[PDB]
Design a protein around this ligand. Sequence first.
Ligand SMILES: NC(=O)c1ccc[n+]([C@@H]2O[C@H](COP(=O)([O-])OP(=O)(O)OC[C@H]3O[C@@H](n4cnc5c(N)ncnc54)[C@H](OP(=O)(O)O)[C@@H]3O)[C@@H](O)[C@H]2O)c1
Ligand SMILES: [Cl-]
Ligand SMILES: [Cl-]
Ligand SMILES: [Cl-]
Ligand SMILES: [Cl-]
Ligand SMILES: [Zn+2]
Ligand SMILES: [Zn+2]
Ligand SMILES: [Zn+2]
Ligand SMILES: [Zn+2]
Ligand SMILES: [Zn+2]
Length: 275
Amino acid sequence: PRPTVIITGASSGVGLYATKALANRGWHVIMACRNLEKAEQAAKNLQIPPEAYTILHLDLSSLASVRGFVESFRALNRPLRALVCNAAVYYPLLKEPIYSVDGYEITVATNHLGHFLLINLLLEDLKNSPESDKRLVILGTVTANPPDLGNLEGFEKGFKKPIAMINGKPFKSGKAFKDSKLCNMLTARELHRRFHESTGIVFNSLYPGCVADTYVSQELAGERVAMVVADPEFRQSGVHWSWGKAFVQELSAEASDEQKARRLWELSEKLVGLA
Ligand SMILES: NC(=O)c1ccc[n+]([C@@H]2O[C@H](COP(=O)([O-])OP(=O)(O)OC[C@H]3O[C@@H](n4cnc5c(N)ncnc54)[C@H](OP(=O)(O)O)[C@@H]3O)[C@@H](O)[C@H]2O)c1
Ligand SMILES: [Cl-]
Ligand SMILES: [Cl-]
Ligand SMILES: [Cl-]
Ligand SMILES: [Cl-]
Ligand SMILES: [Zn+2]
Ligand SMILES: [Zn+2]
Ligand SMILES: [Zn+2]
Ligand SMILES: [Zn+2]
Ligand SMILES: [Zn+2]
């Protein structure tokens, strides 16, 4: 009897050490990955036993792929205990936006909108599971409090070319990334508010520390993801765990983001075909 956790972006970095850590605690990790070849090599290289994992293809930049990943998880007939939204892309060199298969600026489309659809479909799976300690963890920003969503003008007007930023202003890829990470935080917050009572699922977020990409190792950061998913200390919905022993804060900490967080959620449903 082995409890199931899905990890997005599990074939490298933090996601890969997180899957290692959770397997060592005796979990069965669904490595939901873009690149099946790299996922297979990585799994074997870290010496993880075949019972501890299953690789399923997931491309967060395609909503058809998010839907299809979900049907494939369901076919396993494994009760879901947890979900980790860890996958993040970042294209620092782009001067011009790239638009996903579904027509959305790719950074926001992958980091936010694809995780948004994934979360919303898997809530059904999460709420129907008979596991008692069910968590949904999102990798977010340093603190729950540069990114600026404005009045969401870009999302209000449908978020298609020529719109490449959530606030409807000219494309900036580094800001797009930060915007996207803000969306992840706002979404965690809003999952707690909308669903924690009705389901009893723990909805939290974390920041495992600054990590070597383009003061903390991938191994440790991955251990810290595992802690947030699995250990009794971290079993509390509505909060952000940060390593800068963790500082904890309420996801709803910043009161003036309340309206934004709600409007973000409603616009996101529209963008991914839930409304
Ligand atoms: N460095 C910082 O100071 C800083 C700042 C803010 C946030 N963070 C957080 O730290 C975390 C580091 O994560 P990491 O080490 O796992 O990242 P990483 O190894 O540097 O590379 C990106 C990850 O995203 C996955 N991915 C990319 N595109 C995808 C797609 N279209 N569909 C599905 N998966 C995709 C990749 O694996 P596959 O392509 O094989 O799936 C890979 O695991 C991030 O989640 C980020 O939010 C760090
Ligand atoms: Cl597939
Ligand atoms: Cl797929
Ligand atoms: Cl409660
Ligand atoms: Cl759908
Ligand atoms: Zn596939
Ligand atoms: Zn999100
Ligand atoms: Zn109650
Ligand atoms: Zn509670
Ligand atoms: Zn409130």
